[PDB]
Design a protein around this ligand. Structure first.
Ligand SMILES: *[C@@H]1O[C@H](CO)[C@@H](O)[C@H](O)[C@H]1NC(C)=O
Lengths: 48, 49
């Protein structure tokens, strides 16, 4: 019945998927924050 | 230096279908992923060395 409990419930391993999701979200936001101008004329040092 | 856009990277023949009205392509975070030549209009992919 252990295998049935693990198969029927998809959210059984949520406590373990949460850390991976948090790391992925942190990396994604750190990558996306590059487009921020931070008050400058542009976000690309090449053009600046 | 593509029509003013200056950068560094390796240029490769593109395989993505640019629409006839598009001139630039971008990945996440405004990263220029592709550009079309202002001379021969061929699409080129940009990848950091
Ligand atoms: C620009 O000139 C080059 C060489 O003269 C030629 O190969 C190219 O097709 C020209 N492009 C346009 C858009 O006229």
């Amino acid at each position: 019945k252990i295998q049935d409990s693990l198969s029927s419930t998809p959210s059984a391993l949520g406590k373990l998927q949460d850390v991976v999701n948090h790391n992925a979200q942190a990396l994604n936001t750190l990558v996306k924050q590059l487009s921020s101008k931070f008050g400058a004329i542009s976000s690309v040092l090449n053009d600046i | 230096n593509f029509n003013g856009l200056t950068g560094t990277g390796v240029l490769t023949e593109s395989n993505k279908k640019f629409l006839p009205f598009q001139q630039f392509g971008r990945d996440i975070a405004d990263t220029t992923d592709a550009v079309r030549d202002p001379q021969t209009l061929e699409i080129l992919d940009i990848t950091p060395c």
